[PDB]
Amino acid sequence: MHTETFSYLPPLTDEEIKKQVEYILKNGWIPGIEYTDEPGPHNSYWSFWKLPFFNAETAEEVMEELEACREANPDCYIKITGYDNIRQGQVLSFVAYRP
Amino acid sequence: MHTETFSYLPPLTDEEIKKQVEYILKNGWIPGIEYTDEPGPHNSYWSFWKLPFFNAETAEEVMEELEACREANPDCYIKITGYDNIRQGQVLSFVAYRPHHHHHH
Amino acid sequence: MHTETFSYLPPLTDEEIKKQVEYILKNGWIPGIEYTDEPGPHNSYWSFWKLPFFNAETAEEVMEELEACREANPDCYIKITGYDNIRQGQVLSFVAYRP
Amino acid sequence: MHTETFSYLPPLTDEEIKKQVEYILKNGWIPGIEYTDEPGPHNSYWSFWKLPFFNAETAEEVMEELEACREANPDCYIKITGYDNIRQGQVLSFVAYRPHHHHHH
Amino acid sequence: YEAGVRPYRETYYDPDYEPKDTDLLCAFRITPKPGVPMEEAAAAVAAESSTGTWTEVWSNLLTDLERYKARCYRIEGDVAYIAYPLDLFEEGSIVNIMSSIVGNVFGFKAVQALRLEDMRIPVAYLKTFPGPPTGIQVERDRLNKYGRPLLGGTIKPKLGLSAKNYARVVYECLRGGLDTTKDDENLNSQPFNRWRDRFLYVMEAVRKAEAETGERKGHWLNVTAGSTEEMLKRAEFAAELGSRYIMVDFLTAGFAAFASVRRRAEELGLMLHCHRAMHAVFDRQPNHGIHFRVLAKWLRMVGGDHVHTGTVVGKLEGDRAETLGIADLLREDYVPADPGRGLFFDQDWAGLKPVFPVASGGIHVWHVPDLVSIFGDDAFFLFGGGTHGHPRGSRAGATANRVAVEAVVQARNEGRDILAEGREILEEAARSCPELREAMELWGDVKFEVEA
Amino acid sequence: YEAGVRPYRETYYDPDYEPKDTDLLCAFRITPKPGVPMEEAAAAVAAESSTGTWTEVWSNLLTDLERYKARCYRIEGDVAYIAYPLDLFEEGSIVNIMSSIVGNVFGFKAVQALRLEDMRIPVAYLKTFPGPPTGIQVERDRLNKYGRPLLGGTIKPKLGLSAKNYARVVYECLRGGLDTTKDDENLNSQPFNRWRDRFLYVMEAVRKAEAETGERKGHWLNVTAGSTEEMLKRAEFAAELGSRYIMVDFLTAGFAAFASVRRRAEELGLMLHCHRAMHAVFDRQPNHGIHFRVLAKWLRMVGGDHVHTGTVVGKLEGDRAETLGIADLLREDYVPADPGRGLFFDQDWAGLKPVFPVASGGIHVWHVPDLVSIFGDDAFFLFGGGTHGHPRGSRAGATANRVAVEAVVQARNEGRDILAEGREILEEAARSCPELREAMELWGDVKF
Amino acid sequence: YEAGVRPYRETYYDPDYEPKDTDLLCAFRITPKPGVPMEEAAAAVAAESSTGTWTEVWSNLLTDLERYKARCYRIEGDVAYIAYPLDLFEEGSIVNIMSSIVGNVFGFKAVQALRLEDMRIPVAYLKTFPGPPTGIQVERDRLNKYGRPLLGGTIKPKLGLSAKNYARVVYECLRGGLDTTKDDENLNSQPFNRWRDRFLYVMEAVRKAEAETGERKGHWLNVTAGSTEEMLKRAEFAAELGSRYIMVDFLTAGFAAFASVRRRAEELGLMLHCHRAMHAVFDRQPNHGIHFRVLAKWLRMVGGDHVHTGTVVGKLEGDRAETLGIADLLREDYVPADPGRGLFFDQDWAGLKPVFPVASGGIHVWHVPDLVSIFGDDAFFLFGGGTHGHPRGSRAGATANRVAVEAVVQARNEGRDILAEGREILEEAARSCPELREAMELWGDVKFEVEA
Amino acid sequence: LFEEGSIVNIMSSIVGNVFGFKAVQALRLEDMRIPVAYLKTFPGPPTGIQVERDRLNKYGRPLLGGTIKPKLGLSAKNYARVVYECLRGGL
Numbered sequence A, C: 001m002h003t004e005t006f007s008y009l010p011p012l013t014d015e016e017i018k019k020q021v022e023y024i025l026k027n028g029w030i031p032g033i034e035y036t037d038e039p040g041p042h043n044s045y046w047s048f049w050k051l052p053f054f055n056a057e058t059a060e061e062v063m064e065e066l067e068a069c070r071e072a073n074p075d076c077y078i079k080i081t082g083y084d085n086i087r088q089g090q091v092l093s094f095v096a097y098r099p
Numbered sequence B, D: 001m002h003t004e005t006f007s008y009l010p011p012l013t014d015e016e017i018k019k020q021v022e023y024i025l026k027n028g029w030i031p032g033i034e035y036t037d038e039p040g041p042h043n044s045y046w047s048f049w050k051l052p053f054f055n056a057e058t059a060e061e062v063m064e065e066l067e068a069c070r071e072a073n074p075d076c077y078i079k080i081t082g083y084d085n086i087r088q089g090q091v092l093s094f095v096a097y098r099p100h101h102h103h104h105h
Numbered sequence E, G: 001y002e003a004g005v006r007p008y009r010e011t012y013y014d015p016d017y018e019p020k021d022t023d024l025l026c027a028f029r030i031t032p033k034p035g036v037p038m039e040e041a042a043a044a045v046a047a048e049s050s051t052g053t054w055t056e057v058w059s060n061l062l063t064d065l066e067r068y069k070a071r072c073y074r075i076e077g078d079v080a081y082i083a084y085p086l087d088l089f090e091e092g093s094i095v096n097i098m099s100s101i102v103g104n105v106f107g108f109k110a111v112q113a114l115r116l117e118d119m120r121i122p123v124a125y126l127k128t129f130p131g132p133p134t135g136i137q138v139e140r141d142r143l144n145k146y147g148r149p150l151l152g153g154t155i156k157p158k159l160g161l162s163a164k165n166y167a168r169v170v171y172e173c174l175r176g177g178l179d180t181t182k183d184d185e186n187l188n189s190q191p192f193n194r195w196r197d198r199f200l201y202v203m204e205a206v207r208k209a210e211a212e213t214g215e216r217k218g219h220w221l222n223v224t225a226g227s228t229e230e231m232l233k234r235a236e237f238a239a240e241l242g243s244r245y246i247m248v249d250f251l252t253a254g255f256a257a258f259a260s261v262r263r264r265a266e267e268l269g270l271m272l273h274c275h276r277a278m279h280a281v282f283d284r285q286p287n288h289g290i291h292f293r294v295l296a297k298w299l300r301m302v303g304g305d306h307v308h309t310g311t312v313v314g315k316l317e318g319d320r321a322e323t324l325g326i327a328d329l330l331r332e333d334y335v336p337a338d339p340g341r342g343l344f345f346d347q348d349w350a351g352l353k354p355v356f357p358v359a360s361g362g363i364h365v366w367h368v369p370d371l372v373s374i375f376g377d378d379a380f381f382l383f384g385g386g387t388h389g390h391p392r393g394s395r396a397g398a399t400a401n402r403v404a405v406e407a408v409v410q411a412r413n414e415g416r417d418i419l420a421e422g423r424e425i426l427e428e429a430a431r432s433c434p435e436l437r438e439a440m441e442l443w444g445d446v447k448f449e450v451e452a
Numbered sequence F: 001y002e003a004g005v006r007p008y009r010e011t012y013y014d015p016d017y018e019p020k021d022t023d024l025l026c027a028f029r030i031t032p033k034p035g036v037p038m039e040e041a042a043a044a045v046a047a048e049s050s051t052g053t054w055t056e057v058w059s060n061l062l063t064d065l066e067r068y069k070a071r072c073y074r075i076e077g078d079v080a081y082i083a084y085p086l087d088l089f090e091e092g093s094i095v096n097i098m099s100s101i102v103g104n105v106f107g108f109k110a111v112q113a114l115r116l117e118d119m120r121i122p123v124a125y126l127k128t129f130p131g132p133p134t135g136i137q138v139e140r141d142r143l144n145k146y147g148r149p150l151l152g153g154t155i156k157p158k159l160g161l162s163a164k165n166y167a168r169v170v171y172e173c174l175r176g177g178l179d180t181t182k183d184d185e186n187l188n189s190q191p192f193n194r195w196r197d198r199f200l201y202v203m204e205a206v207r208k209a210e211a212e213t214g215e216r217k218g219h220w221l222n223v224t225a226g227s228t229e230e231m232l233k234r235a236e237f238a239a240e241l242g243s244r245y246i247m248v249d250f251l252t253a254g255f256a257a258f259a260s261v262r263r264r265a266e267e268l269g270l271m272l273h274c275h276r277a278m279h280a281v282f283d284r285q286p287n288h289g290i291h292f293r294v295l296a297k298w299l300r301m302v303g304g305d306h307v308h309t310g311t312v313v314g315k316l317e318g319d320r321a322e323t324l325g326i327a328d329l330l331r332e333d334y335v336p337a338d339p340g341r342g343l344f345f346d347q348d349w350a351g352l353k354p355v356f357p358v359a360s361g362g363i364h365v366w367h368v369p370d371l372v373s374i375f376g377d378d379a380f381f382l383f384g385g386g387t388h389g390h391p392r393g394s395r396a397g398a399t400a401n402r403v404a405v406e407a408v409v410q411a412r413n414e415g416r417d418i419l420a421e422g423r424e425i426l427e428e429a430a431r432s433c434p435e436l437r438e439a440m441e442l443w444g445d446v447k448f
Numbered sequence H: 001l002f003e004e005g006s007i008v009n010i011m012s013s014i015v016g017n018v019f020g021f022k023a024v025q026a027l028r029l030e031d032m033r034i035p036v037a038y039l040k041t042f043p044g045p046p047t048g049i050q051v052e053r054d055r056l057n058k059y060g061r062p063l064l065g066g067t068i069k070p071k072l073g074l075s076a077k078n079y080a081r082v083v084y085e086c087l088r089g090g091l
């Protein structure tokens, strides 16, 4: 099963993940974390890990929430999201952790 | 040209017309007079000879209007109407005068 | 048969007609003359007598055309018209002569 | 798996269940017991544990049936129903027993 | 719960019950099986037409039978009065009324004969029905005919006439003075006369007779057919041809299809003549069945513009007192009770339009004084055989009947006693109408027994 | 995010906001609850008619509220001006306008009374609407009538007449000189008079009066009904009979069904008279409701060919200055602001067709000088009681009302002062018209 | 006839008149123009809402004004009672009621202010209306939800949310414990959120939340649009997607289009939530307008399945006594008069289904005890801001409100005084529900003034 | 001057006859300012980028596609084979 953006590249390291979060923050977008145990074309609403981090200031803050979500849901797929309220849409979404 | 109620009986005399007007008034219904030179199935609205006679008390008052209408429109069919405002429906309508040409075909 | 505006008043004298023409000109509207021998509810396009008098400056000019149309069509109804190109519609129309 | 009324409160004790049964009876409504292993939005008809208790007079009689049903179907969700035949509508329905696996996910 | 069989009267006989203004009330004449007490017979009718059956069921306790059960609240002589709650009935559905009130209860072993005499339709339920689309007063306005009974007649032979011949008879009748003519109830669409052919030719006759006489005419084109879709198709063609009328056999077609046709009739601007074919199957015998006055109430609720009511004096049975009650039920805004006419309840019509009574069957000129006396002005008198059986044919026959009606009306309006002077009024009019004299001589010895 | 209740003022009051030409602007007359400042009351109205609610919500951060929020940008006295971004509204839907602008904000505890006085409809939003299906110019061209107010009149009694008697009154009125007649607003289809019967009989009367007089005639057949489907059915039948007109109670039927009928009227070639029944429920009191000029704007946007505007001098209440402003709003291509008539905004009408004002209610011949002075030629003057109430009935009454109008028009065009000489003009015309003299004598002492 | 102007009171003021059971009765609070006697003001309202005008007309004599005229039959204080005959009104048409009763009479010079307080709909006219298609009891059956108020909430921000974001909020609300969610009254179809996009994504959220929680869910999809045809199209798509509900702004769309949508809703098996947007334009002021209780009767007659009724304690105005009367008018089979609640007449509903009251606007957890006490079980409580404004978002907010309702219900059933112990019951429940504690702390100081 | 919602009308005026006049031997329409007031008479895309990405559940990269080749000449079943191979391979 493929999981959309970056799914055809080798699985990302934490450092590569953090660079994507930095890309999200540098552009003024909102980073988020979603997770599910039922990935697939049928599922368009993954579970939110907390809310979109509107108040996130650094990538390290986001990576700490990612690890917490990883620890709390080791059997789930976990993706990083980036959100722009101007176009009102997600500008980036990729799986950071696969069970 | 038949003209509905009583037109299959002999033409009414003034005495016969007056009895029908008395029937209208005895029952508290409103007598009226209408006239036209275009009688027929497509004409629902003949010409009013005055408004309906809401204040008529005797049949002779109505017959006087009939004579007036008859003398003013000798070329027209003239009918007596009787209106019941309770049912809001005509309760008797009949022709009282036909022009000369009607009877000489 | 009635002929719309002013047909429930006594037939107009030439002097009453000219006052209506003056009203048309005073307001900057264009006077015109139309005629027909088939007036009635079915006829929306009476015959133009010449074109609308875009160049008329005086009411006497219009009365001359009216009298000329009168003489050339004694069997016809003749109407005076006033026209406004801003609203793009006639602002007055009345019969000035009946056969 | 939530089970509608009271399922967002802590699981009810037998004392709390009995008070709800007393509420049903005090108001002259008919208590009932139903059970199923297939709870969910597509199941409108759980299994009757006997007919509704039209002749029940005390809450303890109902609690005894609840214990009986609970002991016979430990793998099933069990709910108390309250029926008002005047409005012909259920007036209170809540789950009184959930199987062990419910609480150990 | 307590299973087992209980007498019906324990639950469904309640002589303390006070009928509500929203209750539908029935008067049943009951003949119990010998040995069955009247109270049990009546309770069985109440039970098995509302909520009950033959043994107690646990599911009774899932509802409020005190709200829904019918109850026999009074037994007087052989008449049981039964009240039915409003909520038992489907709004606007005569079919549903029949399914409860006369569905099964006429076939029970415990009740050997049962006759529904009357039914009180409560206003709360009545007004879920529309009533006639036209009504007497609007119909007279559409026809421009005032101050007299209206004239009609069935084309004869009943069956066997081609469409063209059918239209010829119509033409002669209408141009001779009849206001209307009609298809026989059993003329629909048949090998000898297909309905499209008849509709087309007849309306040519209607238009020609109207133009020639100067009086507005109609023909009651029968749309009765085997399916609702076919009846609606024939009504559409009647309207396309400009007919003022259509006709429907509302009992043989049935009430569900009747309601469909009455809806389409109003949408199309048609007036709806209703023939009561089959009614005597239900209403002839006084010990078992449904009296016509009940069928007449249902007829007015759905909304027929006319319905046949009987003649009293003609070839078909009809008691004078019962017919007078039926006419009131059809034409008046409120009808008090009068068991002497078989009206066991009052009936309020809360503004529903009145229906034209239609008197038809075996009548001729000599009957006109009695018919005017029974019905007054607001009725159709139909002369089929009484028109085409004239020695000179249908035109002369139509004239004879029209003159007879007008003569009697004229005399009445003048103050004469049309019952004591009926024959003298006709003889006076015959002096100026040879067609009337010929009709009077032909049928002077033709009479039928009469019942008050 | 920062949860909690904030004053509406912090987000929805921006006194430095410059309205855009695309913004929809509202003038709200605010009566705040005692102790609530005007800035907070105005912000509450702006918030709860656009994007906000009573407490801050996390989902606000999913969108750009700077783009979508309404803003109170100016307060003058007790009038708050609020600007609404164009994107907030559904194209071509008055129903949506009302759902936002008058949806809930009139019932807030914080605002004790509230009145919508005016609305600046941007040209960009007006172009989503079709406007009148006919319009004044096309309507005069269809009627072939130019140079005078048009005559009309409601049939009376309002209710109680049969279809056949009803059309008798119509026939007498039209053959007597009225251009039109109309169903009363409350005459729809009823047991004493069903609409099919009325439509048929009325059109016999119309055609008959047209042939006898030689002038084109019409009757405003009321299609107002309980459902949209029934309204469309009745319009279809009016068109089948060749009627030039139908009529709709656009407020009691409602704007959604009004839009349905307006579309079908244009498809059927019908002109659409609009009655404002119910307007006075909420457009009369100066402290609360919706001003009629706003209703008139919505009316012109949906598309009515006429709407009642009041008489000023008749039995129903009306303000002369406001009426003159409303008349311009209905007829002109552009209407500048004018505080002396309650016109708070310049209104560009973006090429939408104009609407006939209709003056009706308790008027008779003596009012004609005033009415001509107020409205000019582009209006209908309706005489119901002022026609049937004539001593000799409806035909005579119609002739009197037609003569009065034509006489006053003639006098005006000749340069006479029709207010100063109104009595003399009428008396002169009455010397040649006995019908008019009798009307003048009957109602000479009837003022409102 | 006698032409000329007569005072209205000569024909239309009749204090001897006895209202008929079929009469429609109105209670008008009247403020005459100074110098106009109350009797003349009241007669003017009666005349100009039934048959009269400002001068006598000859055509009056062509009908029976004794049958058709409205009559002021009683004046008490500043309230005029006016009776309207049944035949004046078109069956089944609220539009026609409005056109007579409130058409012109509020704008007369002789009457400076006028407020319709109440209206007695007679059974004969009431039953020409169908009422709600579903009703409280059937709706609870369809939802399988018994013994508690039902939970809902408006999605916020009112406008500006994309369809996908809109559906995310719905998902979080429903999976957190709300039974329903709803479009804002002013969200229809707009550039930022087109209706087909919203309907599709929302129903994906509804289905997912239902599967995950195991409880049946709904979303009140707003079909309100600029034309009736568009509203019917959006209702059809809602039904194709399997939605249990649609929503309509019945006053802004208007009653003619409302009736169209209510017919289509039942045909499609949809429940119809009705939003009363614009009502305060008509009903806020006590001197002029129409009180909401009249609008509520009309709402139930057409047949909304719910309607908003006010909260009393929330951000929008609503008196407790008047709200209790409105709830009775919506839910009960018969409602006696009580002018203390503004009910000047009794009202019989003759079997029409009951409407769910919906309490919405500025409410949060602390209000739940009062809301349960005011409305009992048969109501929706809606928390929009009170859900999404939770410090942890919509799911946590939904849970907090659901727990609050259930806790109060549980305590009531046990015999506790939820008014005297309201706050203590919530504090007890918060010990087991952190989401509830957070909601209680956030809004503990947020209150609105209340009126009895 | 323009019919609401009709690009056809725009072209009928702006590029209808003026490109073929003897007096103007060549003509190029370089740009056009569509006023907001005329734009509002048009509905625009039926889906749009944002809603399309939400329907696809694809965010953060260009989307991949490809025309099936040969342009013409492929049967239906062969056509669908190429489609299958492309899509299962990552397009």
Ligand SMILES: O=C(O)[C@@](O)(COP(=O)(O)O)[C@H](O)[C@H](O)COP(=O)(O)O
Residues within 6 Å of the ligand: E153, E154, E156, E184, E185, E276, E277, E308, E309, E310, E311, E316, E358, E359, E360, E361, E362, E363, E382, E383, E384, E385, E386
């Ligand atoms: O078929 C027939 O007998 C008739 O055509 C009468 O023909 P005649 O005029 O030649 O007798 C009528 O249908 C009956 O009168 C119906 O009976 P009722 O009116 O009692 O239902």
Ligand SMILES: O=C(O)[C@@](O)(COP(=O)(O)O)[C@H](O)[C@H](O)COP(=O)(O)O
Residues within 6 Å of the ligand: F153, F154, F156, F184, F185, F276, F277, F308, F309, F310, F311, F316, F358, F359, F360, F361, F362, F363, F382, F383, F384, F385, F386, G048, G053, G054, G104
């Ligand atoms: O019902 C009526 O009163 C009228 O028929 C007037 O009758 P009269 O001509 O007999 O007075 C009109 O509807 C009102 O003028 C409407 O008021 P507005 O024009 O202010 O909406």
Ligand SMILES: O=C(O)[C@@](O)(COP(=O)(O)O)[C@H](O)[C@H](O)COP(=O)(O)O
Residues within 6 Å of the ligand: F048, F053, F054, F104, G153, G154, G156, G184, G185, G276, G277, G308, G309, G310, G311, G316, G358, G359, G360, G361, G362, G363, G382, G383, G384, G385, G386
């Ligand atoms: O638009 C609003 O304000 C609401 O969505 C409430 O949102 P919150 O839940 O965020 O307050 C409701 O429509 C109002 O309650 C309607 O008022 P009523 O119920 O009085 O008609």
Ligand SMILES: [Mg+2]
Residues within 6 Å of the ligand: E154, E183, E184, E185, E186
């Ligand atoms: Mg027969």
Ligand SMILES: [Mg+2]
Residues within 6 Å of the ligand: F154, F183, F184, F185, F186
């Ligand atoms: Mg009116």
Ligand SMILES: [Mg+2]
Residues within 6 Å of the ligand: G154, G183, G184, G185, G186
């Ligand atoms: Mg809302």
